[PDB]
Each structure stands twice: as structure tokens, then as C-alpha cells.
Amino acid sequence: APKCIECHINIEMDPVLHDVFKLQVCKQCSKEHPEKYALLTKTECKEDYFLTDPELNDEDLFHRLEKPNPHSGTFARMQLFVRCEVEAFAFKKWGGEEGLDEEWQRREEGKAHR
Amino acid sequence: APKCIECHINIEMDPVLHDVFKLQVCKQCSKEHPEKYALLTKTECKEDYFLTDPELNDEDLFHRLEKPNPHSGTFARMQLFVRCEVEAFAFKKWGGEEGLDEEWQRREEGKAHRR
DNA sequence: GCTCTACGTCATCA
DNA sequence: GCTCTACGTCATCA
Lengths: 114, 115
Ligand SMILES: [Zn+2]
Ligand SMILES: [Zn+2]
Fold this sequence. Notes:
Radius of gyration of chain A: 16 Å
Number of helices of chain A: 7
Subcellular location (chain B): Nucleus
Helix content of chain A: 40-55%
Bound molecules: zinc ion
Family (chain B): Belongs to the XPA family.
Function (chain B): Involved in nucleotide excision repair. Binds specifically to damaged DNA. Required for the incision step.
Distance between the termini of chain A: 58 Å
Order of helices and strands of chain A: HHHEHHEEHH
Shape of chain A: globular
Largest sheet of chain A: 3 strands, antiparallel
Strand order of the largest sheet of chain A: 1-3-2
Structural class of chain A: mainly alpha
Subunit structure (chain B): Two monomers bind to kinked/damaged DNA (construct with only the C-terminal DNA-binding domain). Component of the nucleotide excision repair factor 1 (NEF1) complex consisting of RAD1, RAD10 and RAD14.
Protein name (chain B): DNA repair protein RAD14
Number of domains of chain A: 1
Oligomer: 2 chains of a larger assembly
């Protein structure tokens, strides 16, 4: 049978990482490696990775899971991205983590400015 | 025999102001009164009246005529609004002609700030 | 640790 | 004297 690609043991994949994000990763290894598998909100993606609404709303660029807004089911749907995908785009976009941290550096000066 | 609201004489209305802007006015009168009947582009509307893309897109708030973009037919469509509508909305929004003039005054001063 | 949008300008590109 | 979008923050509101 096919095996979790992190641990090489488990045969029962995490239903969400599997069905939605297309990753053969079991549940236990999703927890044990949040640097890869942690589901972040759309706002977490904007602020941590400086991704813009036009790239987060590309259907053809990220998988997503959509959830009712925990604040109210009449507010816009919660969207959830798997961290390795957004990270992997964000590292192209800004040229690696070195380059990412420099844009963090750049905007915080902007606040001292204001 | 319905008559032109401007001249009170012609029976034949300008087909565009009639069909599209729902105005009972003749070609000759639209011409003589640009202050009421001139068709303005979407971009003329933003420059001159400080209306915004969200207002000008409201299907339920202005009539519009659409023509192919005169620069290229591959480009986004030209959108044409009638000056009585536009000016009317903008006067409500900016508190009259005087208020629209103040707003003008304010955005010139945004450029004197950015030298 | 929720999201959309609109402000605001302008530059592109279309 | 053509149009949209994006790039900016946020705030507000949904
Ligand atoms: Zn595993
Ligand atoms: Zn007439």
C-alpha cells in the first residue's frame, strides 16, 4: 500500500491534506511538521508572506480549503492555505527567506516613518 | 405627437438619448445644450466629477452607452454617460457645485504638497 | 489569531 | 481627449 511520505509507516492519510491539497501525508506527521503542513488563513498569508489578494485568489495557483467564518456564518468564507505552498510561492516572489526577511525589514521602517 | 422637452417642437428624438438615457430630447437640442446632454467617458467622469469606479459600475445608478475602445477593439469597452445624470449624482455627493469646486481646490493642493 | 472593500494615486497594459 | 488593475496601507463592515 502507499505510505505517508514523511514517516514511511502510516497508510491512512489526513483527509484534508490528501483530498484538498493532494499531499500523501498522514495526520500525526502533519502535526509534527507545521513548518510544512500547517493551514494558514488568508490574512495570515498576507501578513506573514506579503502575498497579495490577486495571487491568493488565483484558483490555478494554490489549493484551498474554505470554511464558514468562525465570527459569523454571514461573513465571507474562511480560506485556508497549506504553508508549504504559500511559502514556496513566497520564496520565488521575494527570492528566498533571505529576501522575504528583507521585505519585513523594509516595511517596519515604513511604520517608524508613520 | 410627443414633443422634445427642450424645444417643445420636434417629434423625432435623438435615438441614443432616447433609447439609452431615457431622455425625450432631439438631436438638435442635445447639441445646443452640452451642459445637460454631452456624453462623457468613464475617465472624463472620474477626472471632472471625482466619481469612483464603484459608482460608475453600479448598473442600477447610471444609464450607459458602450462602444468599442477607439484605440483598439481588443481593449476594454468605452463607456459613455450623460452629463445631467453624472453632474446630478456628483452634486449630491459633494454637496453642490460649490462643494465640487472645493474638492477640486483640495486635490491641486495635494500636488503642491508633493512638489 | 476572519474577510472584503474602499479609500487614494498612478502606472501600466490592455 | 480609452479602460482596468495593481501597487500601496488600513479601516470598516460584513
Ligand atoms: Zn506520517
Ligand atoms: Zn429639441
